[PDB]
């Protein structure tokens, strides 16, 4: 190992800190892993596949172009650079290192592949061909989009997108399951919640949150339960920001928002599947909740969970930490399969008013083959009707006591169409016994006279039958 | 059993008024928000007004907002819409339901509409 010798190095304090304020990646690449044998794969407006710190890496078999449905990526040329987005994420997964050229990726011996699906209609084939595209060639998804952060929308995958990601992780990497890393949202100003976008509510993707240079939750941060973990990217004027590639064959050291943290993620993952090229979608969930770290990360609502696990809504489990990923990687032992279990709550609508709250002790399948022991995902999926949507705040409570927000009050949100079988998802209960009484707690943070029904309430764990802890 | 039931639909000319009404039993009406939402001839769930509990507060869609009124009466155990200046766009089966998203028996059977 030498560390690497790019010009932009140095200024990428979130690989090179000597601070103790980074990903730890160095201690991967010492121990031998920089991605060779990964292939990652970035859906979003295209990618410079000629840019001189990308050409190296750039893999033609992990590309496509969906939009124009040619088998070739390249972004669409415009005076602003609209179309810039992609190439800069694929920098740092997989920059080119010691060559001379700006800086290097986290996993700078991957290959480095990127599907156009953003620079047309996005619609729901489009995101399905996408999603779904050679997946025993393409190991790890980066996907740095998802619905309008306005603080108002509530939307997710349409049917042949959701199959996409069912046949993902249940056929991708010859049943292993393709791995789906997600940007957790930029509507922080509008205090958009995370857990109203069905991307990165999805089980199947890991939502990956951002932290500023001197550890602060971000202005475009945006809160949820259903985010797994954090890496650096960029914050206020005074806190530097990411270094990759951009289009035109240039260098940007100002790239920014939830955008540049799923590709550190994805890169960090890379490096974790060389370590054990056997490990599971859900063996990749497994270890980052273990290893994720809180230090050093600021925020207000650092609780400890019923395993004693340390979580906040801003930061998941906390900053990924690549030296320790890649350490336990390698003793791994691979997870039982997932049993899902679902329990239908309600007997009778409820009124919701200033305060409702549902209690249901469940036994969560117990003497049944979904017998679940050991949580891994919670979802509470709630059919409801309110006349102004954003004034609700939902909680939910598990039986060792980890009050998960479901959803915070959104400013913005004015809608009168309430949820409709809306699945909120909470990381937050991992390796918890799901045995016992849940909560939830739904609210009016309103001085107004709101009003409305909850009509379904179900509640679905995900897990394992284990050992006591 | 729970059971509401809606009444007052039929044929009616443009520009006309309609006022419908649903009837409830089974339960506490007074327990519940009340909303009417209506489907169209090959065209999904419409939410067309709402009311809390006693009356005191209404919500109206943007395409009736001026032209319809939602009021509940919790002794009788009723619930109304008055509906003015119907246009075309209006026909549909009129639902009665205590939720938005709410199915039998908690949505009613309907009433049709016609202009």
């Known amino acids: 190992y030498q560390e690497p010798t790019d010009p932009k190095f140095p200024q990428q304090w979130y690989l090179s800190g000597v601070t103790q304020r980074d990903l730890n990646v160095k201690a991967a690449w010492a121990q031998g892993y920089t991605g060779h044998g990964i292939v990652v794969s970035i859906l979003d407006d295209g990618i410079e596949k000629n840019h001189p710190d990308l050409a190296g890496n750039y893999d033609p078999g992990a590309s496509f172009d969906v939009n124009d449905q040619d088998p070739d990526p390249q972004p669409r040329y415009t005076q602003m650079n609209d179309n810039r987005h992609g190439t800069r994420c694929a920098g740092e997964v997989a920059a080119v290192a010691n060559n001379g050229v700006c800086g290097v990726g986290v996993a700078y011996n991957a290959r480095i592949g990127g599907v156009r699906m953003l620079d047309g209609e996005v619609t729901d084939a489009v995101e399905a061909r996408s999603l779904g595209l050679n997946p025993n060639h393409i190991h790890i998804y980066s996907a740095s989009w998802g619905p309008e952060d306005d603080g108002k929308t509530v939307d997710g995958p349409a049917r042949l997108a959701e199959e996409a990601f069912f046949r993902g992780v249940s056929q991708g990497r010859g049943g292993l399951g393709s791995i789906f890393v997600w940007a957790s949202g930029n509507g922080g100003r509008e205090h958009d919640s995370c857990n109203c976008d069905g991307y990165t509510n999805s089980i199947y993707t890991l939502s990956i949150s951002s932290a500023t240079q001197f550890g602060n939750v971000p202005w475009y941060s945006e809160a949820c339960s259903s985010t797994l973990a954090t890496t650096y990217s960029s914050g206020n004027q005074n806190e530097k920001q990411i270094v990759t590639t951009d289009l035109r064959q240039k260098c940007t050291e100002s790239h920014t928002g939830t955008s540049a943290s799923a590709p550190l993620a994805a890169g960090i993952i890379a490096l974790t599947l060389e370590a054990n090229k056997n490990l599971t979608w859900r063996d990749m969930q497994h270890l980052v909740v273990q290893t994720s770290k809180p230090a050093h990360l600021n925020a207000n609502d650092w609780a400890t969970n019923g395993v004693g696990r340390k979580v906040s809504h801003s930061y998941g489990y906390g900053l990924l930490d690549a030296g320790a990923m890649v350490a336990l990687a390698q003793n791994w032992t691979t997870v039982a399969p997932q049993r899902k279990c679902i329990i239908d709550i309600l007997t009778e609508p409820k009124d919701i008013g200033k305060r409702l709250e549902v209690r249901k002790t469940v036994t969560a399948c117990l003497g049944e083959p979904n017998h679940i022991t050991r949580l891994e995902h919670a979802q509470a999926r709630l059919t409801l009707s309110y006349n102004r949507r954003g004034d609700l705040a939902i909680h939910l409570v598990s039986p060792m006591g980890t009050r998960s927000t479901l959803l915070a009050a959104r400013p913005h949100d004015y809608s009168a169409d309430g949820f409709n079988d809306w699945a909120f998802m909470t990381t937050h209960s991992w390796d918890e016994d799901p045995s016992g009484e849940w909560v939830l707690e739904i609210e009016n943070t309103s001085e107004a006279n709101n009003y409305g029904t909850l009509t379904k309430f179900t509640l679905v764990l995900y897990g394992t039958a284990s050992g006591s802890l | 059993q729970v059971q509401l039931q809606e009444s007052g639909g039929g044929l009616v000319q443009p520009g006309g008024s309609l006022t419908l009404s649903c009837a409830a039993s089974?339960?506490?009406?007074?327990?519940?928000?009340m909303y009417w939402v209506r489907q169209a001839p090959g065209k999904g769930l419409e939410w067309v007004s709402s009311?809390?509990?006693?009356?005191?507060?209404?919500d109206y869609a943007d395409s009736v907002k001026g032209r319809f009124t939602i009021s509940r009466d919790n002794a009788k155990n009723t619930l109304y819409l008055q509906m003015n200046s119907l246009k075309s766009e209006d026909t549909a089966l009129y639902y009665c339901?205590?939720?938005?998203?709410?199915?039998?028996?908690?949505r009613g059977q309907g009433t049709q509409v016609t202009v």
């Open positions: 339901a205590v939720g938005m998203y709410a199915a039998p028996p908690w």
């Open positions: 009311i809390n509990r006693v009356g005191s507060n209404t």
């Open positions: 089974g339960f506490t009406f007074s327990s519940y928000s």
